[PDB]
Design a protein around this ligand. Structure first.
Ligand SMILES: O=c1ccn([C@@H]2O[C@H](COP(=O)(O)OP(=O)(O)O)[C@@H](O)[C@H]2O)c(=O)[nH]1
Ligand SMILES: OC[C@H]1O[C@@H](O[C@H]2[C@H](O)[C@@H](O)[C@H](O)O[C@@H]2CO)[C@H](O)[C@@H](O)[C@H]1O
Ligand SMILES: [Mn+2]
Length: 287
């Protein structure tokens, strides 16, 4: 009972892509009416869930910062449930959560190669969606732990299936995108194809859609393994292959996952989430 024109105005940001050829909106600062959305949603008594993994030193290095900022900026004004996946619960920080925030922690198995830790998330999120998340929330977001919220990340980002535009390529042409280019991988995307380059650090939608996103990405990750090949950018490559075949119903602008190392060009008006500086030497133990 909600139409796009009710809360989305592409004309507010005329200098940037605000609509896809499949009529899906790309939410940029200034184009959305959060107040109209907060009311509409408050009446449906929606609950928004957020999953975040932290295995190894990713725990001590980023979990607290992520959770403290999520608590303060994520879906404010609505019930939110944080789903924390760690390999060692003893090192999990218990920050104080505010109104309408609550959480739960699960201990998971730590995979050997950081590449599998990142890729296994797909299998695990799905298991939890079927087991419980599908019964506790209306929309779900799955994010990387190595980032922090800088401002309101609200209901204007909700949708069937939501994708995030990676900050370094939102202006590049598809043939410049770092898609997997080997036809031997399930993630393969031929030159001449592609809409955008999606970032794996943020994606979401209804539990059902996210269940399908992850199941499909994991089938793809498993297949490559049987074929002795590994996607160039792992799950992101698979995710991009997936969002190609199944266009997202909503796309978030780089303002929702920005990397300050790029600086801050005219297009990024109000950063809502920023990348943590990479510390691979400390947080990773391989390759
Ligand atoms: O040893 C590891 C490798 C990855 N991750 C998780 O997987 C996500 C994606 O990985 P990473 O941050 O290494 O990806 P990048 O954005 O740097 O490609 C991270 O945010 C973490 O939540 C983790 O917990 N432990
Ligand atoms: O290629 C996808 C890959 O990008 C990494 O970020 C790169 C960026 O692509 C590159 O153009 C720039 O020069 O350096 C960045 C590294 O700081 C992401 O970190 C990775 O997660 C993928 O999204
Ligand atoms: Mn990351």
């Amino acid at each position: 009972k909600l139409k796009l024109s009710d809360w989305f105005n592409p004309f507010k940001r005329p200098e940037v892509v605000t609509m896809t050829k499949w009529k899906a909106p790309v939410v940029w600062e200034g184009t959305y009416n959060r107040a109209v959305l907060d009311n509409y949603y408050a009446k449906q008594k929606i609950t928004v869930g957020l999953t975040v993994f932290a295995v190894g030193r990713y725990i001590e290095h980023y979990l607290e910062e992520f959770l403290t900022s999520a608590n303060k900026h994520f879906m404010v004004g609505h019930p939110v449930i944080f789903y924390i996946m760690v390999d060692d619960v003893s090192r999990m920080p218990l920050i104080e959560l505010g109104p309408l925030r609550s959480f739960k922690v699960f201990k998971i198995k730590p995979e050997k190669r950081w590449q599998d830790i990142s890729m296994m998330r797909m299998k695990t999120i799905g298991e939890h969606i079927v087991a419980h998340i599908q019964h506790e929330v209306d929309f779900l977001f799955c994010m990387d732990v190595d980032q922090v919220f800088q401002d309101k990340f609200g209901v204007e980002t909700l949708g069937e299936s939501v994708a995030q535009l990676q900050a370094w390529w939102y202006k590049a042409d598809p043939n410049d995108f770092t898609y997997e280019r080997r036809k031997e991988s399930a993630a393969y995307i031929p030159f001449g194809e592609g809409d955008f380059y999606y970032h794996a650090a943020i994606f979401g939608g209804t539990p059902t859609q996210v269940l399908n996103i992850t199941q499909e990405c994991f089938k793809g990750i498993l297949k490559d393994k049987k074929n002795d090949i590994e996607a160039q950018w792992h799950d992101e490559s698979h995710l991009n292959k997936y969002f190609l075949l199944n266009k997202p119903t909503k796309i978030l602008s780089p303002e929702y996952c920005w990397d300050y190392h790029i600086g801050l060009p005219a297009d990024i008006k109000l950063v809502k989430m920023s990348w943590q500086t990479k510390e691979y030497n400390v947080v990773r133990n391989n390759v």
